[PDB]
Nucleic acid binder design. Structure first.
Ligand SMILES: [Mg+2]
Ligand SMILES: [Mg+2]
Ligand SMILES: [Mg+2]
Length: 46
RNA sequence: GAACGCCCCGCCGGCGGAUGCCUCGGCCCGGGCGGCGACGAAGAGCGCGGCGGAGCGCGAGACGCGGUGCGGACCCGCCCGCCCCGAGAAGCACCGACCCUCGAACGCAGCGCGCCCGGCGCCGCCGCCUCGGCGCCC
């Protein structure tokens, strides 16, 4: 034995696998073109 | 003397908000009811109307959207719109959805950043996968 310390053994780790979906329907958000842009600002400076 | 001041013989004006009458409000008693939340509550922030400050309401589907019933001429301003044996304004009741940030508040922080390309908090119960021990044995 080379190291004098005891560390936790390496053990298998699993990936997730939910039995039902937590978001069954994919809904929209704030961002989409024509909603992210509101209007232009019209001045003589502009 | 006049005038100022004071009293009222009377006629008018101010300033102030008492009195009287009125009341979509309080207070007391009795009867019901006893119905929140990780399926994200109570509370807080911000935003939403054609002209839109406050409060009510609503959530980027925002001063509301749909479905079943009922109702049957209006919609406080300016406009729009509806109008008829159904074509459908006000209003009402139940039901289905949408539901931004913070909050028990859940990737870390509170407004800035990550690991990973589905996602990514803590405790507990029951199972399951993979494992440690010079514990008791073989
Ligand atoms: Mg949306
Ligand atoms: Mg307002
Ligand atoms: Mg959070």
């Amino acid at each position: 034995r080379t190291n004098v310390h005891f560390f936790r053994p390496k053990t298998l780790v699993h990936k997730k696998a939910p039995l039902y979906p937590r978001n069954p329907i994919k809904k929209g958000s704030w961002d989409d073109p024509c909603d992210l842009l509101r209007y232009p600002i019209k001045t003589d400076e502009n």
